[PDB]
Amino acid sequence: TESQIPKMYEMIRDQMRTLASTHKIPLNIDHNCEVIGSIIMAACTNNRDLRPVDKYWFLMGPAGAEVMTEVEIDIQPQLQWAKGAVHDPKYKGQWYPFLALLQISNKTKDTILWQKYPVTQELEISNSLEIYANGHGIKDRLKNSRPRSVGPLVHLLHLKRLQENSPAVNGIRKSIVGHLKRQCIGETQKAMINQFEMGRWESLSTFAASLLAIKPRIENHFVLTYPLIANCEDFAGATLSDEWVFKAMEKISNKKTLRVCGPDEKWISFMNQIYIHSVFQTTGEDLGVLEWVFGGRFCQRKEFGRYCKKSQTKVIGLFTFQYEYWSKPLKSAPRSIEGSKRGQISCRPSFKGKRPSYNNFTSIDTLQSASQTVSFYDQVREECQKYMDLKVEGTTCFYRKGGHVEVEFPGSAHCNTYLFG
């Protein structure tokens, strides 16, 4: 499944530099790579909506005198290659599943800079839940190539849209539900999806809230963004899922040739952190964990105002990256109550001596563990409290840099803080 990753990375980077050098467009500027990279993406996917010759905005000029200017560029070489490469048997069909991950990676930056909440706004649920709407805005043909990488509310938004629009309805609805029930591990959650499948949406707010307790299964992959791809000189053992990516970004960072763009120099750490969020998909991650992993503090998006408009970005510094530990991408749900037992959570004193009094429950509702028939909302709450009661998240381990020696994450005072908090 990753045998072709090396050669597909190579093919992307090549088409990028071919098209950039033909029009004298320097690829040591990350903004140029972002625009060139998205044009190549569009030739592989929506072959018919882009124009054979069109004008785009690049940083043109010599040796740090670059200015943004509209360059007319011709894609019919890249277009002809792209329409073949979709079905080329040499890639063993691994092309579209790879393009979808590449689009998730390369669209991450804009979802950070231009924080909106299209999916929870359309579903009419709390915008705290947009963290589970990832992969929104990917071309649909790519979405069918990576349904496990698409957040559960994207699938849920697809289901409700279906009910507000043919005999193919029985087959489309079946597969959307199928993607939903693989992601949503809760017994009460699958029951709620069943209700949604029959158009009964009363459970929506409760289902949506349950996703922060009984967390869904979201597949992650570590995919380089277009500026990294163009400036990577060796894809020899490329993976999307182990220390290679970490080592690849350190190698480019050490080259100190790729420059990054932004509104002004106060953004230079943030831009660089945005590379980590795109490649490793840590946009939703705990910032305390991230600081430990990469060895530096991460900004929250609050710490800056609105991004400037893409035409008014400027070079503001150099790409930089380093890391202290690494980890593989999570594929299973982060929390499991399998073989979990809430044990003693209260004191039964035997000494008369006074001492502080604890209650490890918010109310006696949180301890109602049910035999006598129970109501559905209580079923939900009880199942959620079981996952809430877990004190650890994740599945295996972090590794020290330069090997696979397992190092337990020690903790942080910056834990339980978040990029959009």
Hey, which residues between 308 and 347 contact a copy of itself (CB under 8 A)?
325, 327-331, 334-335, 341-347
Yes or no: say if 141 and 96 are a contact pair by the CB < 8 Å rule. Answer: yes
Q: How far is the CB of 77 from a copy of itself (least distance, A)?
A: 36
Q: Is 111 in the site for a copy of itself (CB under 8 A)?
A: no
Judged by CB under 8 A, the residue of 48, 51, 90, 391 near a copy of itself is: 391
Q: Is 305 in the site for a copy of itself (CB under 8 A)?
A: no
Q: Given the complex with a copy of itself, which of 86 and 367 has the nearer CB atom?
A: 367
Q: Is 112 in the site for a copy of itself (CB under 8 A)?
A: no
Q: Which residue stretch of 55-63, 66-74, 197-205, 307-315 sits at the interface with a copy of itself (rule: CB under 8 A)?
A: 197-205
Q: Given the complex with a copy of itself, which of 74 and 382 has the nearer CB atom?
A: 382
The three-point CA angle 213-214-215 to 5° equals 95
Q: Which of residues 128-147 bind a copy of itself (CB under 8 A)?
A: 128, 131-132, 134
Q: Residue 376 forms beta bridges with which residues?
A: none
3-26 burial string, b = 16+ CB within 10 Å, else e?
Answer: ebbbebbbbbbebbbebbeeeebb
Q: Given the complex with a copy of itself, which of 116 and 256 has the nearer CB atom?
A: 116
Judged by CB under 8 A, the residue of 13, 146, 179, 381 near a copy of itself is: 381
Q: Which residue stretch of 29-37, 126-134, 168-176, 248-256 sits at the interface with a copy of itself (rule: CB under 8 A)?
A: 126-134
Cβ neighbours of residue 378 closer than 8 Å, sequence gap 6 or more? 368, 370
Judged by CB under 8 A, the residue of 38, 394, 401, 414 near a copy of itself is: 394
Q: Is 177 in the site for a copy of itself (CB under 8 A)?
A: no
Q: Which ranges constitute the DSSP H helices of 211-317?
A: 226-230, 243-255, 268-280, 287-294
Judged by CB under 8 A, the residue of 215, 235, 238, 273 near a copy of itself is: 215
Q: How far is the CB of 421 from a copy of itself (least distance, A)?
A: 5
Burial of 184 (0-12, 13-18, 19+ CB in 10 A): buried
Three-state SS annotation for 15-65: HHHHHHHHCCCCCCEHHHHHHHHHHHHHHHCCCCCCCCEEEEEEEECCCCC
Q: Is 307 in the site for a copy of itself (CB under 8 A)?
A: no
Q: Which residue stretch of 12-20, 44-52, 311-319, 385-393 sits at the interface with a copy of itself (rule: CB under 8 A)?
A: 385-393
Q: Is 163 in the site for a copy of itself (CB under 8 A)?
A: no
Q: Given the complex with a copy of itself, which of 308 and 367 has the nearer CB atom?
A: 367
Yes or no: say if 290 and 358 are a contact pair by the CB < 8 Å rule. Answer: no
Q: Which of residues 265-304 bind a copy of itself (CB under 8 A)?
A: 280-286, 289, 293
Q: How far is the CB of 341 from a copy of itself (least distance, A)?
A: 7
Cβ neighbours of residue 69 closer than 8 Å, sequence gap 6 or more? 57, 58, 60
Judged by CB under 8 A, the residue of 63, 67, 168, 370 near a copy of itself is: 370
CA proximity to 213, closest of 421, 388, 377, 361: 388
Backbone angles phi, psi at 418, to 5 degrees: -145, 155
Instruction: Look up residue 181 and give its two tokens.
Output: 């029930």
Q: How far is the CB of 381 from a copy of itself (least distance, A)?
A: 6
Size of the site for a copy of itself (CB under 8 A): 92
Yes or no: say if 279 and 105 are a contact pair by the CB < 8 Å rule. Answer: yes
Yes or no: say if 222 and 279 are a contact pair by the CB < 8 Å rule. Answer: yes
Distance separating alpha carbons of residues 301 and 180, to the nearest angstrom: 30
| Beta-sheet pairing, 398-400 with 325-326 | antiparallel
Judged by CB under 8 A, the residue of 78, 210, 272, 273 near a copy of itself is: 210
Q: Is 234 in the site for a copy of itself (CB under 8 A)?
A: no
